[PDB]
Amino acid sequence: ALNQEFIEENPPMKRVLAVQDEPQFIMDAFFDLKCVRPMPVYSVPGLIDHF
Amino acid sequence: ALNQEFIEENPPMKRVLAVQDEPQFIMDAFFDLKCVRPMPVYSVPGLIDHF
């Protein structure tokens, strides 16, 4: 029927894969952020009246 | 003998000097240092968080 079970992505990976009962994808990901932030790059303790 | 008593400097000043029993040299010395130092030229008390 045209419903939730029909439109949700559900490819039959279990039949095209040689090894049974292990996760389909193993992934390594790396996130390289350049950040400008409202804080110093290293904070030294001190400066009581300041900020 | 060639020993400590022979090589130590020991000029016979007591015989060439007119006044007996006063120190041979009277000296005035003055040491003019220009210093660059890791401190301010005058320190005012204060600045608690700082340095």
In Å, what resolution does this model reach?
Answer: 2.6
Q: By the 8 A CB rule, do B46 and A49 touch?
A: no
Residues in Cβ contact with A51 at an 8 Å cutoff, skipping those fewer than 6 apart: none
* B17 and B24 Cβ atoms separated by less than 8 Å: yes
What is the DSSP code string of A4-44? HHHHS----HHHH-SSSSS-S-------------SS-SS--
- The backbone region for B23, taken as left when phi is positive above 0, alpha when psi lies in -120 to 50, beta otherwise, is beta
Query: Which helix H or strand E contains B16, and what residues bound it?
Result: helix B13-16
Give chain A's length: 51
C-alpha closest to that of B11 among B20, B24, B27, B2: B24
For residue A47, give the nearest of B31, B2, B47 by alpha carbon.
Answer: B47
Alpha carbon distances (Å) from A30 to A17, A27, A33, A37, B15: 26, 10, 10, 21, 92
Tell me which chain A residues have a C-beta less than 8 angstroms from the C-beta of B48. 48-49
Q: Which residues of A touch B49 (CB under 8 A)?
A: 46-50
CA distance B46 to chain A (A): 12
From chain B, pick out residues whose CB is under 8 angstroms from the CB of A47: 49-50
Q: How many CB pairs under 8 A join A and B?
A: 9
Residues A16 and B10: their CA atoms lie apart, in Å, by 106
Do the Cβ atoms of A17 and A24 come closer than 8 Å?
yes
